[PDB]
Amino acid sequence: SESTIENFLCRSACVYFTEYENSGAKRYAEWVLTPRQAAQLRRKLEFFTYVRFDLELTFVITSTQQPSTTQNQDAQILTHQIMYVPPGGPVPDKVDSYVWQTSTNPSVFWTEGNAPPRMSIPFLSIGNAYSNFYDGWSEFSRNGVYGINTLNNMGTLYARHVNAGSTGPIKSTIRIYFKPKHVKAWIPRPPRLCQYEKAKNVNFQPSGVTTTRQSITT
């Protein structure tokens, strides 16, 4: 009963943690949607070849007062904007760009001190199932990289500070949770055995089959 894929692949897993400020060089966050960065969830997803699911994104945004020497401070409430760029959509080159205003990118404004913001993304493949494993080239020409189908593109995620609250410096961290929903899986395949190296490929270092013992009669 706990072994159904709905009960095996529907756990809120943290897949990204970063920090952006109201002043300074770092002013926004970005993260191409891809589920292969967290190994604990990648290893569970890699039990099947093709998986079709929906995503529930939960963001935990917390702001800390950066140490500074600016006198006479009195902060206001901070408002954040999380803009989710759908596949084939314009992406911001800077914080105060004109791409944050585009209407086809469903951004969500959230005011500090409430329930965490949350939005649900539907199946975004132009095909019939996401492919955990691909045995081909991205392009017909030699230029195409091996094992990278352009059909598992889930989009990108940009976050920023709508306004600078106080006159002092403030750093805000954003944690992203991944929760797959309505999961269907096809063609089960063996577990990893080896350790993971990169997020883009299945490259690995050859390892033993299992752990050793004193003797065969032990």
Partner: protein
């Protein structure tokens, strides 16, 4: 109390970021997984000879059998705990069982003698009950739950061990488990081969599951570093 809080394990309805978008209909792709138990019911080769450099090669799986010096000597032996045990923790069964904290059921074991079509012998596969220790000699093994396996007639012998359950919490590695049984093989007779036929032959083992298997309290996998 209990509202305006974010709990990781909650099932609520979420506002769709992109509505008015027609998702592609589903198609018929072969081999749809419904439950993880079906995966745990496929026989998987068991590395019985995980001794030294044997693991970093292909000979870890094969079990060596020699006609000489085996009047009644033991061929092999291992405890009967799938998950948490060097011989079974890496199979399909063991890999599924290393996700749950509580599991009980029955295990199926299949041995396939891989030798010439002209070799004949006998073996004495014995099953020790949980509390009882592994047998010291061939007689002790016979006075129990044995199966005399003749490789001339049958080329494959199947077992169905019951009373298999979780023996420890978290993850432990230990030889000779107290609450688990032991499967041992003894040379009842030696390998009898004619002229111009190799007398050194190998065996292989396949571990599966059964209809009466339960798995509860899913946790993290300990093989991730």
């Amino acid at each position: 109390p209990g509202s305006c809080q974010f709990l990781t394990s909650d099932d609520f309805q979420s506002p769709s970021a992109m509505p008015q978008y027609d998702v592609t209909p589903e198609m018929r792709i072969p081999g749809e997984v419904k439950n993880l138990m079906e995966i745990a019911e496929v026989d998987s080769v068991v590395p019985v000879q995980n001794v030294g450099e044997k693991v970093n090669s292909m000979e870890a799986y094969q079990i060596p059998v020699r006609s000489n010096e085996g009047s009644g000597t033991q061929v092999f032996g291992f405890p009967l705990q799938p998950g948490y045990s060097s011989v079974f923790s890496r199979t399909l069964l063991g890999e599924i069982l290393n996700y749950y904290t509580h599991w009980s059921g029955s295990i199926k074991l299949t041995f396939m003698f891989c030798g010439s079509a002209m070799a004949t012998g006998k073996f004495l596969l014995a099953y020790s009950p949980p509390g009882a220790g592994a047998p010291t000699k061939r007689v002790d093994a016979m006075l129990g739950t044995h199966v005399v396996w003749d490789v001339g007639l049958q080329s494959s012998c199947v077992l169905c061990i019951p009373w298999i359950s979780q023996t420890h919490y978290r993850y432990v590695t230990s030889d000779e488990y107290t609450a688990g049984g032991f499967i041992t093989c003894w040379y009842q007779t030696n390998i009898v081969v004619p002229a111009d036929a190799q007398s050194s032959c190998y065996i292989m083992c396949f571990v599966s599951a059964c209809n009466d298997f339960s798995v509860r309290l899913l946790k993290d996998t300990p093989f991730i570093s």
